[PDB]
Amino acid sequence: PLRRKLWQNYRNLTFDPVSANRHFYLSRQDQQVKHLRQSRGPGGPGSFELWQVQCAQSFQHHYWEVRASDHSVTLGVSYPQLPRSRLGPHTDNIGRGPSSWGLCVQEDSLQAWHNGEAQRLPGVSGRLLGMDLDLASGCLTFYSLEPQTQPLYTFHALFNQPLTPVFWLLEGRTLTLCHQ
Amino acid sequence: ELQLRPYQMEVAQPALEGKNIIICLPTGSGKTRVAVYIAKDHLDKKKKASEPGKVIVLVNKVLLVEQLFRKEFQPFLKKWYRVIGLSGDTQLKISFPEVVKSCDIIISTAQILENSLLNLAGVQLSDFSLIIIDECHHTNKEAVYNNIMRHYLMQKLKNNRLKKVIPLPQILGLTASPGVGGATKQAKAEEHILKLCANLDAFTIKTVKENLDQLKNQIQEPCKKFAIADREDPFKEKLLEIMTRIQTYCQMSPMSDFGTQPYEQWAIQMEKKAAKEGNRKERVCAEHLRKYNEALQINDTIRMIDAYTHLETFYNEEKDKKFAVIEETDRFLMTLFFENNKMLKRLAENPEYENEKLTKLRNTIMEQYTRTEESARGIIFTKTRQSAYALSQWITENEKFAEVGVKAHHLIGAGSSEFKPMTQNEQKEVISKFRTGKINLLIATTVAEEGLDIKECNIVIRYGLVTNEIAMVQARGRARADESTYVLVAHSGSGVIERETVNDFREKMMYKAIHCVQNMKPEEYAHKILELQMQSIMEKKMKTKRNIAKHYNNPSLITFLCKNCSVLACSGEDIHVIEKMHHVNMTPEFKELYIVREKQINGEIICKCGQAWGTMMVHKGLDLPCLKIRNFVVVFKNNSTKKQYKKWVELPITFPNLDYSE
RNA sequence: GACUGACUGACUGA
RNA sequence: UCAGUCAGUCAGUC
Ligand SMILES: Nc1ncnc2c1ncn2[C@@H]1O[C@H](COP(=O)(O)OP(=O)(O)O)[C@@H](O)[C@H]1O
Ligand code: ALF
Ligand SMILES: [Mg+2]
Ligand SMILES: [Zn+2]
């Protein structure tokens, strides 16, 4: 019932071909993303050097669902000023500075990053995830849907710029959206 | 600051005054520092009463010589005593007995002592006082350690005779898994642990039974995890095509499918019997099918290009040798092989095709490094040198890895006619680069499984390895870091997972069996040990009498024949030896028979056949070519059969040395 | 940097 | 009791 009450603030989303990284691939009317070993041509400008992809939509509340093929993947939201270059060895940028907020899912445990800090959270078996944000209250909440609903975590903040969703994928991993 | 933690003192308390013992703590328990402290108190106590004292540490891998000479003894005893670290690479400027009289802590590889002891002015085992044996479970049926301990036992029995004395040095030994000698029943494990204690001449096992909570805190059981998999590709069956046709040419009997060991063994024996017959048109075919099977097996283990390189590197050198004699059956191979290998080379370069195991390993390495975030060292254990070098290349080439921060290098042992041999100083520089942290995913073979000391290694991966239980108790150990992961990779085709299960069960058996021997009644322990001591000596006498029987020699009786042809080469008298080591010939017509070939400092000999006989080697100003017996056939004059020997010591013949007077 | 020789251990096979 | 691949240890000649 809680997800049903959420669903009247559901919002449809789509990717941006410019922001897609080299080895990644877009599909299903730009609603599903996969990552392959062989390069899809040179990257060029407008593409994040680190392994992320951003959606075309952004929000000036809102809620949605993302299905994930497997673990070791990250979902989050940032301000429009997210850096697109790489200056460090590790290949994920969400949560390193204050300008974003991310949640990384793995086989063992969950890690929610912001301002370069995060805390271990007990792991979850399910793959499907849900996520909500209210700018008026300035809060961002995550949810695990299977088998039951769990309010995994909440972030308090004040926003002066719109938020754009950004996704981080490994090799051999896939990520799909949902629509209604 | 030798302030030992409590349980180390618990285990070392009995050894601190007489009573030669053993000691076993699990990996990460600082056993080496227990050795340090015991040696310190030994030397201090002997000095107080002003009596001569020395200590020798026996290690069994050379890498560990420098490790234990630089990390642990050196700082903790830099001031009070004189410590010297010797090994098999260092070019000593002084003979060993002068070294022993020169210093008083000697860190050495055991084989050096054993050389210096059977040399009869040498050295006698009574000179020393403390004999520390690191990783002493290798004391077993005629190993390098056991010869030393057998001199010790002969002296002990001589003292038991003398009582109706010459003091014997106190012994200490350090282990992590004394192991069971292939035993399915409790009684046999009990027997084996007793036999080990016997050969070391111990008093007990003395494992910590008081401070259990502290020990369970220091040592971390790492997380075990299983990456297992089992893609259509022509290459395996594409080559099955060619090799099936090659077999059909001579219609040989498989007796088993392809890609597995029995087929390779079968090829070996058929080759041998055919060569004994003289049946050409078959020898070359059998050996080529063997090469193809090896290619399939390498294609199993490593990436595809390495298999293709093995094939082409054999064949092009074959044709190079063959076209030198220029300046029926043979052509049948190349005229097929070259079309098919151009096909292969275009086939193998296509990278979307892949092996199965490598994909799982690829997933593991990159995923796990991505999660670590720059606090991550890894060791990948493998089986063959070639595998090590190939994995290093495959890590370097494809560019996705280098962005996630993996920096890789291969570590193998010194001393095989392939890619490039690593040598001693290169290896030392490699582990030196690895300890600080600019080499991050070290790929190693058996050499680094008992002894490495790296304070931080998160990740230990095992690659398609099958082995006994001690080489599995230690390899988990090398992951001496917190939140460690021991990840096993294999495809179910070969018996790797079933081996994992039996090994784990043998680990349980071994621990319980030590607990069993821990608690015997001392009368029984003493008497069983005495009987066990007697047993080894008597069986050595039996083997020695059989050996002096087996050595039994006219050098002129036999004649050597070529092995791919059967054209007579020479007779025994033409053979001589340089320094009992290099078999060589000086004869002039035997010089006109062969053809040098350079593609060079040392030239390879070739027959008319294209098969190789030996190499040119220059001695004391003579230019002279040698011979290798593996490439010939021996024909007697008593029974006209045909025999092959693998290595020169097999042949019952004794050869004279190169009169040099001519 | 190149070439040899010999002890030894684990795995598989009669 | 014999064969077979594999790793490690030592010793010579350039
Ligand atoms: N008194 C001590 N205090 C803290 N750490 C110690 C102490 N003694 C030994 N260690 C640790 O033990 C490690 C050495 O263990 P070692 O005996 O080499 O393991 P293994 O028994 O597998 O060879 C060192 O890295 C050191 O950090
Ligand atoms: F003595 Al160890 F690993 F147990 F070097
Ligand atoms: Mg040790
Ligand atoms: Zn010939």
DSSP secondary structure code for residue B251 in this structure: T
Is B404's CB within 8 Å of A38's CB?
A: no
Find out whether the beta carbon of B30 lies less than 6 Å from any atom of ligand 2.
no
Q: Is the dihedral of CA B437, B441, B445, B446 positive or negative?
A: positive
Q: Whose CA is nearest to atom 26 of ligand 1?
A: B30
Q: Please count the other Cβ atoms lying within 10 Å of the Cβ belonging to residue B76.
A: 17
Write out the two tokens for B568.
């007579």
Smallest CA-to-CA distance from B369 within A52, A74, A89, A167 is with: A89
Q: Please check whether residue B276 is in contact with residue B644, taking contact to mean a CB–CB distance below 8 angstroms.
A: yes
In this structure, how many other beta carbons lie within 10 angstroms of the beta carbon of residue A26?
17
By C-alpha distance, which of B157, B28, B259 is closest to B535? B157
Cis peptide, bond prior to residue A45, ω within 30 of zero: no
Burial class (CB in 10 A: 0-12, 13-18, 19+), A94: buried
Strand nucleotide closest to residue B110 (CA to C1'): D9
DSSP bridge partners of B225:
B487
The Cα–Cα gap between B60 and B110 comes to 6
Beta-bridge partner residues of A120: A111
Residue B388 corresponds to which amino acid? A
Q: Helices (H) and strands (E) in chain B — how many of each? A: 22, 21
Q: Which residues of A touch B366 (CB under 8 A)?
A: 170-171
What residue type is B497 in one-letter code? Answer: I
> How far, in Å, CA of A86 to CA of B616, rounded?
58
Q: How far is the CA of B629 from the centre of ligand 4 (A)?
A: 14
Residue B132, beta-bridge partner list? B57, B172
Distance in Å from D7's C1' to B412's CA comes to 10
Q: Is A97 exposed, middle or buried (CB count within 10 Å of its CB: 0-12, 13-18, 19+)?
A: middle
Amino acid at A142: F
The amino acid at B535? Q
Query: In 3D, which of A61, A59, A63 has the Cα closest to residue A3?
Result: A63
Question: B528 with B202: CB under 8 angstroms?
Answer: no
* Experimental approach taken: cryo-EM
- Contact criterion met (CB below 8 Å) for B404 and A89: yes
Which of B266, B236, B238, B237 has the alpha carbon at shortest distance from B252?
B266
Q: Which of B528, B564, B554 is nearest to B638 (CA)?
A: B554
DSSP codes joined into one string, B506-541: HHHHHHHHHHHHTT--HHHHHHHHHHHHHHHHHHHH
Separation of alpha carbons B39 and B30, rounded Å: 15
Q: Quick check: B362 and A171 CB within 8 A? A: yes
Q: Encoding tokens for residue B104?
A: 């008083």
Give alpha helix (H) positions in B13-54. Answer: 31-48
Residue B480 is inside which H or E element, if any?
Answer: none
**Cα–ligand 3 centroid distance for A92 (angstroms):** 39
Cβ–Cβ contact B363 with A under 8 A: yes
Ligand 2 centre to CA of B27 (Å) is 6
Please give the protein residue whose CA is closest to the C1' of the nucleotide D10.
B111
Among residues B25, B367, B1, B14, which one has the least CA distance to residue B177? B25
Which residues is chain A interrupted after (C–N above 2.5 Å)? 60
CA B260, B266, B271, B272 torsion-angle sign: positive
Q: Is B351 in the A-facing interface, judged by CB distances under 8 Å?
A: yes
B33 lines ligand 1 (CB under 6 A): yes
- Which residue out of A52, A72, A105 would a mutagenesis test of the B interface target, given it has the greatest number of B Cβ atoms within 10 Å? A72
Q: What share of chain B is helix, strand, coil (3-state, %, to 5)?
A: 45, 15, 40
CB within 8 A of B93, min separation 6: which ones? none
Which residue CA neighbors atom 1 of ligand 2 most closely? B31
Question: What contacts B529, CB < 8 A, 6 or more positions away?
Answer: B194, B197, B198
Give how far Cα B285 sits from Cα of B5, B246, B606, B629, Å: 66, 7, 20, 22
Residue for token digits 């989050």?
A: A76
Of all residues in chain B, the one with the smallest CA distance to A91 is: B404
Judged by its nearest atom, the ligand closest to the C-alpha of residue B177 is: 2
Backbone angles phi, psi at B216, to 5 degrees: -60, -20
Tell me the CB-side half-sphere exposure of residue B432, using CA atoms within 13 A.
8
Q: B404 in contact with A at a CB cutoff of 8 Å?
A: yes
Residues recorded for chain B: 662
Whole-number Å distance between alpha carbons of B391 and B410: 8
Whole-angstrom distance, CA of residue B513 vs CA of residue B493 = 33
- Segment A153-161 long-range contacts (CB within 8 Å, at least 24 positions apart): A153/A103, A153/A110, A153/A112, A153/A121, A155/A101, A155/A112, A155/A114, A157/A101, A159/A79, A159/A135, A161/A79, A161/A80, A161/A81
Which residues in chain A have Cβ-Cβ distances shorter than 8 Å to B400?
23, 37, 171
- In the block, tokens 């720059």 appear at B374
- Helices then strands, counting H and E runs in chain A, come out as 1, 13
Q: Nearest protein residue to C13's C1' (by CA)? A: B262
